[PDB]
Amino acid sequence: SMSVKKPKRDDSKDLALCSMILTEMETHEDAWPFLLPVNLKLVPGYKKVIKKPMDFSTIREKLSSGQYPNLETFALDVRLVFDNCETFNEDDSDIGRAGHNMRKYFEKKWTDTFK
Template sequence: RWSDAAAQLRSPSASTSSRSPLPGRSRSTEIILMEMEAHEDAWPFLEPVNPRLVPGYRRIIKNPMDLGTMRTRLLRGGYSCPSQFASDALLVFDNCRTFNEDESAVGRAGRSLRRFFESRWGFFLYFKLLFSN
């Protein structure tokens, strides 16, 4: 499936103006987010944390972030560059680490999804460099 993503990145049609994504959107960030949302450990991060169900969360976490909020931002062109997307993804995991115990189910899910994201993001950066010439 990542070979398909790589093919899309190199595809001549991917660079034509009629098929170019909105500002701040790229096929790569859309694919990465879609795969993160489908990951088996994404369940705690799909929607914003409900402060009624998780008392004290907003007191500890000053800048909440989740995959649903990232999707909304991506679809609305809220990222001016892919690095802003990556910053939000890392914020999800940093917030998880700050609020949850390492060996809790949510803490383990956060570490797993972070590793997944970092591998995909590294792949994205590699292909971006490889095909930027």
């Protein structure tokens, strides 16, 4: 509360570390569905159904341009990629499986880096 602060968690490496995590996700073999925005002209249903589209290139641009106020808003966008994927794709599709694999991969790196 006013003039009463919890001790300062060192966040000075957060930007670099999120950037490293994102690099790892970008270079994963199962990242291919997620590297660019889903083409809304060519994928019927996507525009209407997925209210907040997100992809790795869009996270990378946001990260490089100071549009994440903190490491939690970065994690929210990464999870949004996977949440969108599950909303739109059957679990037993290549894309559906890729999205589960990538979410697992991400969450481990997130835990090991920050928890």
